[PDB]
């Protein structure tokens, strides 16, 4: 006797949404899927980002442990840790989202600098805004959400936030922006 069979799905469930006018927040649960992230310390967000940029590209580029030659297209997001001065100085963690096309069975990490790990059991707040959004905007919206979420049991640590974006546009014109806030 013998048999087999399984599935593969990581849907996200929302607990509730809302917030103040202009800017709204959304509480969702981490799907728990596997993603490729990198760790960069002793370097500024500018260095850690410029260093991780190519580090993550090497994976999807073809430098995989399994030697898979397919390719994936998706926006990458990294975490940041603001300080009392507003400057992001401490640590930087890059997160590369993988498309369902690869999620079905992504290749192993050819390098240690970037490994595929999954994160689940965390609750963050998503806030989307339109109009001209510059680099500083992302840092401002992060704190703006804090006061906007006022009157709620929602907690935070260091006001840490995440930045999601496809690629750096030749101009500051940021029509689309994304900022996630991990509740403490």
Curated annotation (Swiss-Prot):
Ubiquitously expressed. Extremely abundant in liver. Pfam families: SOUL (PF04832). The keyword Cytoplasm applies. InterPro entries: Reg_factor_effector_dom_sf (IPR011256), SOUL_haem-bd (IPR006917). GO terms for biological process: heme metabolic process. GO terms for cellular component: cytoplasm; cytosol; mitochondrion. It comes from the Eukaryota. Keywords: Cytoplasm. Signal peptide: none annotated. Monomer. Belongs to the HEBP family. This is Heme-binding protein 1. The lineage of its organism: Eukaryota, Metazoa, Chordata, Craniata, Vertebrata.
